[PDB]
Amino acid sequence: KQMDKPEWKRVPNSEEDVRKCFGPRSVSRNFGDSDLVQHGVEAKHFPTIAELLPTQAALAFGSEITTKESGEFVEVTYHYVMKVPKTDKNLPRFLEQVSAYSK
């Protein structure tokens, strides 16, 4: 069903993985190791990683949001910044996911 939803409402899993939902890892979409890419939210360590992912409301009210018309679409850009304490136990495994494809 994920691929029947708009891209921004997709929740990847083992059936419909990250590759199928959001395409291959790149400079534009750089988050997720092989495990997360293949199993999405069903990945073993995803719950640990998700501790440093903002909520839907936090994204809305904590981001700089800009829009511009692009063909038959309105392109919405979110710029969100969050500071995580270096002592955070979930931070190491999260950082390993950042540009994991290039590591």
Added chain:
Amino acid sequence: KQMDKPEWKRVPNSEEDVRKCFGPRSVSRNFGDSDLVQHGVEAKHFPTIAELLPTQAALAFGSEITTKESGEFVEVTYHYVMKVPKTDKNLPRFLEQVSAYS
């Protein structure tokens, strides 16, 4: 409470509003009209606006994420871009929220 959570896990409501959870509206935090600011996710039209907000997984796997060390913290930046069809019924109300404070 929401103020007992890290800022990125806060879900504002009528008790702990957007201003309390994420501070005043500004050029850096520009989303939300007076109704959304005062009632957060309890705002009457928040569900309509929420139709154009990405899921936590979509944000994770669809964003350009960059990190930088800052003192005793690691600053995590998310750059997410989504293309909404101009026909989307939720888009007009969503656009009214962008820089509503100004």
